Design a binder for this molecule. Sequence first.
Ligand SMILES: [Mg+2]
Ligand SMILES: [Mg+2]
Ligand SMILES: [Zn+2]
Ligand SMILES: [Zn+2]
Ligand SMILES: [Zn+2]
Length: 177
Amino acid sequence: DAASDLKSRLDKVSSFHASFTQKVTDVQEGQGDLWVKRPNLFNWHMTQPDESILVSDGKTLWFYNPFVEQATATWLKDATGNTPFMLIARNQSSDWQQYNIKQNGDDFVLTPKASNGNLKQFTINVGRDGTIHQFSAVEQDDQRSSYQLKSQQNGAVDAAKFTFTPPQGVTVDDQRK
Ligand SMILES: [Mg+2]
Ligand SMILES: [Mg+2]
Ligand SMILES: [Zn+2]
Ligand SMILES: [Zn+2]
Ligand SMILES: [Zn+2]
Protein backbone atom coordinates (compact mmCIF):
# COMPACT_ATOMS: atom_id res chain seq x y z
CA ASP A 1 0.00 0.00 0.00
CA ALA A 2 1.12 3.64 0.24
CA ALA A 3 2.84 3.17 3.61
CA SER A 4 4.86 0.19 2.43
CA ASP A 5 5.70 1.89 -0.89
CA LEU A 6 6.94 4.98 0.94
CA LYS A 7 9.09 2.97 3.34
CA SER A 8 10.64 0.96 0.52
CA ARG A 9 11.55 4.18 -1.28
CA LEU A 10 13.15 5.57 1.88
CA ASP A 11 15.17 2.35 2.28
CA LYS A 12 16.31 2.14 -1.36
CA VAL A 13 19.68 3.76 -0.64
CA SER A 14 21.51 2.25 2.33
CA SER A 15 23.93 5.17 2.81
CA PHE A 16 23.74 8.73 1.59
CA HIS A 17 24.18 12.41 2.17
CA ALA A 18 21.42 14.80 1.14
CA SER A 19 21.62 18.59 1.34
CA PHE A 20 18.48 20.74 1.35
CA THR A 21 17.53 24.39 1.18
CA GLN A 22 15.28 24.89 4.19
CA LYS A 23 12.29 27.19 4.64
CA VAL A 24 10.55 27.73 7.98
CA THR A 25 7.66 29.87 9.20
CA ASP A 26 6.10 30.14 12.67
CA VAL A 27 9.69 32.84 5.45
CA GLN A 28 13.00 32.06 7.13
CA GLU A 29 15.54 30.39 4.84
CA GLY A 30 18.16 27.98 6.08
CA GLN A 31 20.12 24.86 5.27
CA GLY A 32 19.30 21.25 6.11
CA ASP A 33 21.78 18.36 5.84
CA LEU A 34 21.03 14.67 6.33
CA TRP A 35 23.54 11.82 6.53
CA VAL A 36 22.09 8.31 6.72
CA LYS A 37 23.33 4.75 7.18
CA ARG A 38 20.32 2.43 7.29
CA PRO A 39 18.66 1.35 9.35
CA ASN A 40 19.56 3.15 12.60
CA LEU A 41 22.37 5.64 11.92
CA PHE A 42 21.84 9.27 10.98
CA ASN A 43 22.99 12.84 11.43
CA TRP A 44 20.68 15.77 10.82
CA HIS A 45 21.77 19.40 10.88
CA MET A 46 19.66 22.48 10.17
CA THR A 47 20.02 26.22 10.73
CA GLN A 48 16.37 27.30 11.12
CA PRO A 49 14.56 28.25 13.24
CA ASP A 50 17.64 27.71 15.41
CA GLU A 51 20.74 25.70 14.59
CA SER A 52 20.07 22.14 15.66
CA ILE A 53 21.99 18.89 15.40
CA LEU A 54 20.58 15.39 15.82
CA VAL A 55 22.89 12.39 15.86
CA SER A 56 21.99 8.73 16.25
CA ASP A 57 24.86 6.38 17.06
CA GLY A 58 22.54 3.40 16.65
CA LYS A 59 21.18 3.27 20.21
CA THR A 60 21.55 6.80 21.57
CA LEU A 61 20.00 9.84 19.95
CA TRP A 62 21.85 13.08 20.73
CA PHE A 63 20.07 16.42 20.39
CA TYR A 64 22.42 19.41 20.29
CA ASN A 65 21.67 23.13 20.11
CA PRO A 66 25.16 24.70 19.63
CA PHE A 67 24.11 28.26 20.49
CA VAL A 68 23.09 27.06 23.91
CA GLU A 69 26.06 24.81 24.66
CA GLN A 70 23.56 22.10 25.59
CA ALA A 71 22.89 18.56 24.46
CA THR A 72 20.37 15.93 25.42
CA ALA A 73 20.89 12.17 25.18
CA THR A 74 17.87 9.89 24.75
CA TRP A 75 17.23 6.31 23.66
CA LEU A 76 16.79 6.14 19.89
CA LYS A 77 13.98 3.62 20.41
CA ASP A 78 12.02 6.24 22.38
CA ALA A 79 12.09 8.81 19.57
CA THR A 80 8.97 9.66 17.57
CA GLY A 81 8.27 11.11 14.14
CA ASN A 82 7.60 14.52 15.66
CA THR A 83 9.27 16.40 12.80
CA PRO A 84 9.62 15.80 9.06
CA PHE A 85 13.33 15.06 9.30
CA MET A 86 12.79 12.59 12.16
CA LEU A 87 10.17 10.72 10.12
CA ILE A 88 12.66 10.36 7.26
CA ALA A 89 15.54 9.55 9.63
CA ARG A 90 13.56 6.82 11.42
CA ASN A 91 11.64 5.47 8.40
CA GLN A 92 9.61 3.18 10.63
CA SER A 93 6.54 1.23 9.58
CA SER A 94 5.14 1.94 13.04
CA ASP A 95 5.39 5.68 12.28
CA TRP A 96 3.75 5.60 8.84
CA GLN A 97 0.88 3.45 10.16
CA GLN A 98 -0.12 6.38 12.36
CA TYR A 99 -0.92 8.53 9.36
CA ASN A 100 -3.61 8.63 6.73
CA ILE A 101 -1.44 8.52 3.61
CA LYS A 102 -2.35 9.57 0.09
CA GLN A 103 0.00 8.80 -2.78
CA ASN A 104 0.22 9.75 -6.45
CA GLY A 105 3.45 8.57 -8.02
CA ASP A 106 6.45 10.03 -6.19
CA ASP A 107 4.22 12.36 -4.16
CA PHE A 108 2.91 11.55 -0.69
CA VAL A 109 0.73 13.61 1.65
CA LEU A 110 0.20 12.45 5.23
CA THR A 111 -2.13 13.55 8.02
CA PRO A 112 -2.25 12.04 11.56
CA LYS A 113 -5.00 9.51 12.23
CA ALA A 114 -5.33 10.75 15.80
CA SER A 115 -4.93 14.02 17.70
CA ASN A 116 -2.17 14.58 20.26
CA GLY A 117 0.43 14.94 17.54
CA ASN A 118 3.06 17.59 16.93
CA LEU A 119 2.60 17.02 13.19
CA LYS A 120 -0.60 18.08 11.42
CA GLN A 121 0.78 17.28 7.98
CA PHE A 122 3.82 15.84 6.24
CA THR A 123 4.52 15.67 2.51
CA ILE A 124 7.37 14.20 0.54
CA ASN A 125 8.43 13.66 -3.04
CA VAL A 126 10.76 10.69 -3.28
CA GLY A 127 11.32 8.52 -6.32
CA ARG A 128 11.77 4.78 -6.44
CA ASP A 129 15.50 5.45 -6.82
CA GLY A 130 15.53 6.80 -3.28
CA THR A 131 16.25 10.41 -4.22
CA ILE A 132 14.39 12.75 -1.86
CA HIS A 133 13.46 15.77 -3.98
CA GLN A 134 11.48 17.60 -1.33
CA PHE A 135 9.53 17.26 1.89
CA SER A 136 7.52 19.49 4.19
CA ALA A 137 5.45 19.60 7.33
CA VAL A 138 2.98 21.58 9.38
CA GLU A 139 3.29 21.24 13.15
CA GLN A 140 0.64 21.56 15.89
CA ASP A 141 1.79 25.12 16.64
CA ASP A 142 1.03 25.86 12.99
CA GLN A 143 4.77 26.04 12.28
CA ARG A 144 5.50 25.15 8.67
CA SER A 145 8.74 23.99 7.07
CA SER A 146 9.76 22.82 3.61
CA TYR A 147 12.94 21.38 2.14
CA GLN A 148 14.10 21.31 -1.46
CA LEU A 149 16.95 19.01 -2.49
CA LYS A 150 20.18 20.76 -3.47
CA SER A 151 22.14 17.56 -4.03
CA GLN A 152 22.08 13.95 -2.87
CA GLN A 153 25.27 11.91 -2.88
CA ASN A 154 24.80 8.16 -2.48
CA GLY A 155 27.65 6.24 -0.87
CA ALA A 156 29.51 5.26 2.29
CA VAL A 157 29.61 7.82 5.09
CA ASP A 158 32.38 8.24 7.67
CA ALA A 159 31.58 6.59 11.01
CA ALA A 160 32.49 9.77 12.88
CA LYS A 161 29.35 11.37 11.47
CA PHE A 162 27.34 8.99 13.65
CA THR A 163 28.98 9.74 16.98
CA PHE A 164 28.56 12.84 19.12
CA THR A 165 31.03 14.94 21.08
CA PRO A 166 30.26 18.52 22.07
CA PRO A 167 33.14 21.01 21.87
CA GLN A 168 33.56 22.35 25.40
CA GLY A 169 31.41 24.08 27.99
CA VAL A 170 28.53 21.97 26.72
CA THR A 171 26.30 20.37 29.34
CA VAL A 172 24.84 16.92 28.63
CA ASP A 173 21.41 15.99 29.98
CA ASP A 174 21.20 12.19 29.90
CA GLN A 175 17.58 11.07 29.63
CA ARG A 176 18.37 7.40 29.01
CA LYS A 177 16.77 5.39 31.81
MG1 LIG B 1 26.59 18.21 3.51
MG1 LIG C 1 14.40 16.87 -7.72
ZN1 LIG D 1 28.41 15.37 1.62
ZN1 LIG E 1 26.05 24.14 12.12
ZN1 LIG F 1 13.62 11.63 -8.87
